[PDB]
Design a protein around this ligand. Structure first.
Ligand code: UTL
Ligand code: UTL
Lengths: 302, 302
């Protein structure tokens, strides 16, 4: 029995019209064109021989309005350049006519957002990722994918929350929010950086367990319950994130009739082993589906 | 170590502009607007009390050009209606100005295509699925999602290959190609239909095994080899599809330096059990990634 859950990505047509190509000399990447402002990663100015320890402040001063090349596949003239954190704020004389209603937001561990992967300013693919507790993502990025934007949708408003900056040694990826701050303790330099531990998202696993009940799989459900305070103490020593209930989780509980504390008890025993049984065709707990994802994809609740 | 493979979907901006809402009385669904032709599932005309065994030929004759309502969220007037297979060919007086270069094609088991899920003519999400050997897909569809289109991209040309029609008892989904034929032996009627067995795609599993070698995971590789003819005979009695090599598979073999026949031997022994080890963080063989997907996402080869 298929669960009915897939890695669902927001329609990217609105974001596609905001993609531009930014060239600052020997390197090119992607930029986000909203109104008269073009956002792009700040390491575009860096020469290839100085990628390990850039001095970005000196590089920015060395730049000139005419030395930024913005092209849409239409060529954009730069009338103002500024730096905020690990991002460049380039001003252009032409405002994007296809600018959607948008906000800037910071995504949190356990939350999912859609990513529009681009190369040379041309979108190539889209996918959805969940921001891991170590503030990395398990994406698919290659050379030239920097400037690809991660976003969430709330109605007709697009909340941009991610811009790809680097790939880690373990194959994961990390970027920066649109306030200039990279997620986690990572810095946009071509050096090895200490990566925090990754943890199972308790909120997402409970949502995944609830989706099993919504598909007829409830062999793991027992009337025994574990309190949120007891589960959180257990989670601290088992690489599990502390569980924080939300209204979305409550709807799954009220629909299925299974208490969250019942599932938290199940998570503790399912962690020790599935004992040869399967849930949703899987032998391991899944934290890649948010409670919202189960809410919309299964019951059509947004 | 993350593999670097995600469920990547084609950018859906081109297809989004081709989505319309088709209403034929008490039921509404989604339609594909290309040139002066609107395609939609044929059960839109059916009344809710006759969904189990429609007589579509009689229903079509009972219809009138004015009785089809096409709306884009712009209202389209219907000047011609015709039926081909399980699809309706509605002609409209206005050609879609955003019509992309497109072709109609039939997708095969083991191949992957992108799906734009829509409701009331408004796209809601996108995802990629692999057509299973039983000619079903493991999608995420709900009531009103019929008319959502599956497509592949070859350059700037979009090859439409799927239109959602129904959900099966096991939670999977099936649709029809744009020649009117449903995939597999399924018929667009609200009755239980016999579903063929599902099988592991040998081509996709070999691609998944190759991706492990490209990420440093090669514990399963042994110099022992199994010929394609011997593996195919083995596959016939183990719910595995017969393996057919392609140029895409050859590139992975030539890059990794591992023969395909070496992997086919590995598949036979990995089927009997992973013996407590993991590949790409999984304890089961994955056939949801095509050789092309590994080619583009890992090595940037399209
Ligand atoms: C976008 O331009 C690009 C995206 C990556 C290319 C390969 N895969 C990607 O996702 N980012 C960079 O080129 C980036 C630029 C720096 C100024 C931040 N370099 C980078 O992070 O390269 C990835 C490395 C694995 C090389 S970082 C690393 C890790 C260990 C180590 F020992 C040295 C460097
Ligand atoms: C699009 O209008 C819609 C898509 C499905 C709605 C629920 N999930 C979907 O993906 N398709 C239908 O409404 C479709 C129309 C028929 C004329 C083909 N009905 C349909 O296939 O419903 C799904 C069922 C599970 C009800 S089929 C079935 C299976 C076993 C059984 F015993 C009876 C009916």
């Amino acid at each position: 029995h298929h669960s009915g859950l897939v890695k669902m990505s927001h329609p990217s047509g609105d974001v596609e019209a905001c993609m531009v190509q930014v060239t600052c000399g020997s390197m090119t990447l992607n930029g986000l064109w909203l109104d008269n402002t073009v956002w792009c990663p700040r390491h575009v100015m860096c020469p290839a021989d100085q990628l390990s320890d850039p001095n970005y402040d000196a590089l920015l001063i060395s730049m000139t309005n005419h030395s930024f090349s913005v092209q849409k596949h239409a060529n954009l003239r730069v009338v103002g350049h500024a730096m905020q954190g690990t991002l460049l704020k380039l001003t252009v004389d032409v405002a994007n006519p296809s600018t959607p209603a948008y906000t800037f937001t910071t995504v949190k561990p356990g939350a999912a957002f859609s990513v529009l992967a681009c190369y040379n300013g041309r979108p190539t693919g889209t996918f959805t990722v969940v921001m891991r507790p170590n503030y990395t993502i398990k994406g698919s990025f290659l050379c030239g994918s920097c400037g690809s934007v991660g976003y969430t949708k709330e109605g007709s408003v697009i909340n941009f929350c991610y811009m790809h900056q680097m790939e880690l040694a373990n194959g994961t990826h990390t970027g920066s929010a649109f306030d200039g701050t990279m997620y986690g303790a990572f810095m946009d330099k071509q050096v090895h950086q200490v990566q925090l531990t990754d943890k199972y998202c308790s909120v997402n696993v409970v949502a995944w367990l609830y989706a099993a009940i919504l598909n007829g799989c409830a062999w793991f459900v027992k009337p025994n319950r574990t309190s949120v305070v007891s589960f959180n103490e257990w989670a601290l020593a088992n690489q599990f994130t502390e569980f924080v209930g939300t209204q979305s989780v409550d709807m799954l509980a009220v629909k299925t009739g299974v208490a969250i504390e019942q599932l938290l008890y199940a998570i503790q025993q399912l962690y020790t082993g599935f004992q040869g049984k399967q849930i949703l065709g899987s032998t391991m707990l899944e934290d890649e589906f948010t409670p919202e994802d189960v809410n919309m994809q299964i019951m059509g609740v947004v």
